[PDB]
Write a protein that binds this ligand. Sequence first.
Ligand SMILES: COc1ccc(N2C(=O)CC[C@H]2c2nc(-c3ccc4onc(C)c4c3)cn2C[C@@H](C)N2CCOCC2)cc1Cl
Length: 113
Amino acid sequence: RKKIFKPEELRQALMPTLEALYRQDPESLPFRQPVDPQLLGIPDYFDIVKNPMDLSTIKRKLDTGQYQEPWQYVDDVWLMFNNAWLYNRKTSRVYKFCSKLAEVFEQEIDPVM
Ligand SMILES: COc1ccc(N2C(=O)CC[C@H]2c2nc(-c3ccc4onc(C)c4c3)cn2C[C@@H](C)N2CCOCC2)cc1Cl
């Protein structure tokens, strides 16, 4: 089950699953850029989230061939969701938006896997 992927083959296969998340409006808006705790007024963010991830970082990694294997891309998307569920309360808009993106992703990534 070892396989060497061509970065452009990975990119073409995975990019549509990422585009599916970006297309969610307004649910993708809090996930489009890295969390800046001071500028968002959430100074405890890095006390709780030690491995931040967002759509712009995942896109940059896809675009520069930093994923060797599909599971590495999926791990970063899952990390982004896990961070938002960890930091935010179940009652919050961001937590609910995260749950929407995770549903969309589960649909998109199944066939690709
Ligand atoms: C359309 O939905 C929203 C619009 C604004 C906001 N925001 C606010 O109410 C305050 C600032 C802004 C905002 N919140 C967050 C926020 C906060 C906590 C988070 O935990 N995990 C994540 C991810 C996360 C994200 C981010 N933002 C700023 C977003 C909307 N920027 C706005 C500037 O352009 C890029 C996107 C949140 C949402 Cl759910």
